Write a protein that binds this DNA or RNA. Structure first.
Lengths: 256, 247, 84, 149, 86, 133
RNA sequence: CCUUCUCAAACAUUCUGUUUGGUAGUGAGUGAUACUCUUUGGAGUUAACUUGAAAUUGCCUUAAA
């Protein structure tokens, strides 16, 4: 495992690096990067892998955005049939129990009709933080909503396995959204070797809990992609090796 | 003058078509070469859409049978792409509202999937094919006189003797057996028939029939579903009822 | 089809061949022989009829092809041109 | 014009059939369930009457204005282009009043006005008025100009 | 005329409404005058049946309105079924 | 006075030199057309140029279609001064990618990794952000 | 003057848990953080930020007439 005290001194040292010498809100947020052997080439993907975590930072994010201005919040898009079936009253029964709330539900006709006018499309979505979609529709979206959504890692859409096959029920979601809120995090596959993660903020939950979450993702991912090395920064800082893996470096010419 | 709006819609719909069909082309190549890790659904699918309408789902699970298939026009911006144009021109569906029979199998189940939006699909009935082949059917004859490249009506089972006696075939209800029962390899018939050139359902352009044309187009919008999705079900309809109109 | 429902005969041509059952080929023209057998009481069964769904059934059989094959040893057979 | 009518025919009005159908529905719903005239939605369609339209102007609320050329007591409408000029409002003259009779269900109307439109067509309208502004502000700004010489 | 007005305008809903809102003609008095009624009618059936059975084997095409053809087919086989069962 | 060169912009998608050619052949047998794509993953940056033959042909085309509307872009077209010389925009495709590597050996690049690991640690140390190892 | 890939499986039933796969974008720029390659040629991957879809230059036939 990585030294947790190396993590702890890293966070305190960048705290002092950020304390004294819009902009500060860009700077202060933490990024963690992984290099790996190679991602899938000649196949351009937009899917997201939902890596399990023990503690969500979205409740800190929501408590922060109650005060802040970017208005951390969610959007939903669905098939055409279910709008008459579902409403906000059910989730207002269920999700305030845990103390979260869905803003809106949308249909694809709404999406193509009123959030056309690409300026207005972007402007509608940009206030939203977390974008969520149907397991069916997820492949169809980018012809509709476009890659300005997909460039920003927050605004990149995510499916949900909605249809309890058959005769879909809402309860299948009112547990699943709780799962993905509290207990999972979506992460992207680019081309190449390099992969960024907008992991979180330091004003949110402690480095002690972030350390074990980082341990969880790293133990999950050392097997996942045969990964090369891991570094961290906060939005300018040159890379700090905290995991330096060279046993995987021996295989690169073995592949060829 | 050519109305650039019409031009760009033409090009765009052909762009959509060229896109989805190159998708399904190298998809079906990947199915055939059987590297089948990255596919949504490894299997085929079927929608028997019938009667504000009812929709029923299955797979082929072939088990092949016969089908009867007709060119309908559409949709409405699509200049001919080559990679469908050749295969449909083999299949002799040009000069639209022409109807032909087929026997399904796995080599050809993709061919219907590409030609799908250009065509209507369904399986026929015994009465339907009986009425069809008894009321219609057109054949060239060549021999011993009279070169005469004329499409000539079916009157003669002596023509069936002299042209299909190699197959042991007279008595055209034997052809009905070949079709209906998927008889002995059936390509004699499928090369022979000069298949049916059907009637325009509502000619018109009087006012009363303009209405009917619009009703027809609306029913087609209701009953046709061009999902274009490359895993989509194949569509099937009540051609028994529909040829009651069209025959 | 078009079954009739309610609510001396043609003497003799009505009810000729009464209590007859003809297993009729598909090759023969049905659309006229069926009018006559409906005129003079008799049942017909065509072989294409059952495609979708001990001394019982074979009373008579209708085939008027000149040549027929493969004929089997169990043929208690007439030809129908006499009936025609 | 063709684009204009592709737009407008979406926001065509309610006919009698649909009105009585709507009325029967909201008669069904007013009694037991609800009505604050919310049983039905806000309708959105053309405003077409002359007096009403020109009343809406100087409030002022019309997003677009369409003016027939061929009205026989032309003094009815001679003031209008000046009016929408002076109030800075999106007017344009059209060719044939019977067209407007098509789109608001009359023999003819001589004026069509838009004040309200659902959201999907806002930028479509925006480009539309930009087009006619690009037809009037530069080349039919000269409608008073071009004295011969 | 009203329908063409509705089509050069629109309000195709009312066009369909207008189509439903007509009363096609009947010929019962025509029959009851031209053949009074029964024995003369059955005297003169023959030329009807010839044209009827001709057209029911005649195929569908333009200039037909094949509604007519399937109507002829059913009325023909009604005749056949009656006279067969009798 | 102006030239037969014309500059059009504010184009939609699906509108390519195929379309321009078969359209503006209505107005004249063209001297030349050029279109603006991106060079990388080549798709339209929504403008182009043309000369049909003549100054008058360019003038009437511009006069006709200055404020012309379509699907919901509208083109703006303008007439240019004497010359003004369309000079560039070879028509760029979406290119096939080719892989020139990895020639250098695993052992040498691993030593590169070893030394630049330490290089990284010292540059963040001198930033200054101290780090052991 | 078209109108968008609207879902599939595996299991055991969960009145649904796990896994699998499934997208190739409007373009324009804004500034600027990191990793590969090979030789500078930067080819590919990396914080977010504007824009009314904006903008001037990177060897088939009846859907006729």
């Amino acid at each position: 495992a990585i030294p947790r005290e190396r993590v702890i001194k890293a966070v305190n040292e960048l705290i002092k690096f950020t304390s004294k010498p819009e902009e500060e809100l860009k700077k202060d947020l933490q990024l963690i990067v992984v290099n790996n052997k190679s991602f899938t080439g000649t196949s351009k993907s937009f899917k997201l892998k939902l890596l399990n975590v023990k503690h969500s930072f979205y409740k800190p994010w929501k408590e922060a955005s109650a005060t802040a201005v970017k208005d951390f919040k969610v959007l939903l898009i669905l098939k055409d049939s279910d709008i008459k079936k579902v409403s906000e009253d059910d989730l207002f029964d269920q999700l305030d129990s845990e103390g979260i709330k869905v803003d809106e539900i949308i249909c694809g006709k709404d999406l193509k009709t009123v959030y056309k006018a690409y300026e207005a499309r972007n402007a509608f979505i940009s206030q939203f933080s977390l974008i969520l979609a149907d397991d069916s529709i997820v492949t169809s979206l980018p012809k509709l909503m476009g890659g300005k959504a997909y460039n920003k890692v927050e605004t990149t859409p995510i499916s949900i396995r909605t249809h309890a096959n058959k005769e879909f029920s809402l309860t299948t979601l009112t547990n699943n959204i709780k799962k993905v809120y509290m207990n999972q995090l979506p992460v992207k596959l680019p081309r190449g070797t390099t992969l960024n993660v907008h992991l979180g903020n330091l004003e949110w939950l402690r480095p002690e809990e972030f350390v074990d979450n980082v341990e969880l993702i790293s133990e999950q991912l050392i097997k996942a992609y045969q990964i090369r090395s891991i570094f961290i920064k906060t939005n300018r800082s040159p890379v700090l090796p905290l995991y330096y893996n060279q046993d995987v470096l021996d295989e690169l010419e073995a592949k060829k | 003058f050519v109305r650039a709006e019409s031009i760009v819609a033409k090009t765009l719909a052909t762009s959509r078509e060229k896109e989805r069909i190159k998708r399904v082309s190298i998809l079906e190549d990947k199915k055939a070469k059987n590297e089948t890790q990255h596919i949504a659904s490894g299997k085929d699918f079927i929608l028997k859409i019938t009667e504000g309408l009812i929709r029923e789902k299955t797979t082929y699970d072939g088990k092949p049978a016969l089908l009867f298939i007709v060119r309908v026009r559409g949709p409405l911006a699509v200049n001919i792409p080559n990679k469908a144009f050749k295969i449909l021109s083999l299949l002799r569906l040009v000069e639209t509202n022409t109807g032909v029979f087929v026997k399904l199998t796995k080599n050809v189940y993709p061919l219907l999937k590409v030609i799908a939006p250009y065509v209507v699909i369904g399986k026929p009935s015994l009465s339907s094919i009986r009425s069809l082949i008894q009321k219609r059917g057109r054949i060239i004859y060549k021999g011993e006189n009279e070169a005469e490249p004329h499409e000539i009506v079916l009157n003669d089972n002596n023509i069936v003797e002299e042209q299909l006696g190699d197959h042991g075939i007279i008595c055209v209800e034997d052809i009905i057996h070949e079709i209906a029962t998927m008889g002995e390899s059936f390509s004699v018939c499928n090369f022979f028939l000069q298949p049916f050139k059907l009637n325009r359902e509502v000619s018109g352009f009087g006012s009363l029939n303009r209405l009917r044309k619009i009703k027809q187009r609306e029913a087609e919008s209701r009953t046709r579903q061009f999902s274009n999705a490359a895993t989509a079900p194949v569509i099937e309809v009540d051609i028994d009822s529909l040829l009651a109109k069209l025959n | 089809s078009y079954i009739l429902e309610s609510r001396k005969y043609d003497s003799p041509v009505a009810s000729l061949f009464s209590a007859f059952v003809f297993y009729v080929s598909r090759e023969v023209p049905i659309d006229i022989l069926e009018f006559l057998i409906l005129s003079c009481g008799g049942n017909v069964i065509s072989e294409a009829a059952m495609d979708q769904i001990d001394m019982s059934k074979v009373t008579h059989q209708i085939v008027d092809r000149p040549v027929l094959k493969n004929k089997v040893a169990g043929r208690t057979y007439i030809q129908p041109q006499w009936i025609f | 014009a063709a684009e204009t009518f592709k737009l407008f025919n979406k926001y065509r009005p309610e006919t009698a059939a649909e009105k009585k159908e709507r009325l029967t529905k909201e008669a069904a719903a007013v009694a037991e369930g609800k009505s604050k005239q919310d049983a039905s939605p806000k309708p959105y369609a053309v405003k077409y009457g002359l007096n009403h339209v020109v009343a809406l102007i100087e409030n002022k609320k019309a997003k677009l204005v369409l003016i027939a050329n061929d009205v026989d007591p032309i003094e009815l409408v001679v003031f209008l282009p000046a009016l929408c000029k002076k109030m800075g409002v999106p007017y344009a003259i059209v060719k044939g009043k019977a067209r407007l009779g098509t789109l608001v269900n009359q023999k003819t109307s001589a004026v069509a006005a838009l004040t309200e439109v659902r959201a999907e067509d806002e930028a479509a309208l925006a480009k539309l008025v930009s087009t006619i502004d690009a037809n009037f502000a530069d080349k039919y700004d000269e409608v008073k100009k071009h004295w011969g010489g | 005329r009203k329908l063409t007005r509705a089509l050069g305008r629109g309000e195709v809903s009312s066009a369909k409404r207008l189509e439903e809102n007509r009363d096609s003609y009947t010929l019962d008095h025509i029959i009851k005058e031209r053949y009074p009624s029964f024995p003369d009618a059955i005297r003169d059936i023959d030329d009807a049946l010839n044209m009827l059975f001709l057209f029911s084997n005649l195929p569908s095409t333009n200039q037909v309105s094949s509604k007519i053809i399937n109507d002829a087919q059913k009325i023909c086989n009604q005749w056949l079924a009656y006279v067969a069962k009798e | 006075e102006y030239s037969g060169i014309i500059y059009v912009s504010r184009l939609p998608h699906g509108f390519h030199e195929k379309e321009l050619s078969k359209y503006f052949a209505q107005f004249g047998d063209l001297k030349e057309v050029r279109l603006a794509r991106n060079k990388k993953t080549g798709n339209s940056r929504h403008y182009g140029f043309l000369e049909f033959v003549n100054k008058e042909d360019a003038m009437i085309a511009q006069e006709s279609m200055n404020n012309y509307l379509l699907m919901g872009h509208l083109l703006q077209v303008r007439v240019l001064p004497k010359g003004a010389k369309i000079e560039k925009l070879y028509k760029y495709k979406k290119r096939v990618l080719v892989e020139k590597g990895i020639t250098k050996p695993v052992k040498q690049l691993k030593d590169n990794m070893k030394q630049k690991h330490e290089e990284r640690i010292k540059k963040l140390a001198k930033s200054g952000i101290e780090f052991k190892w």
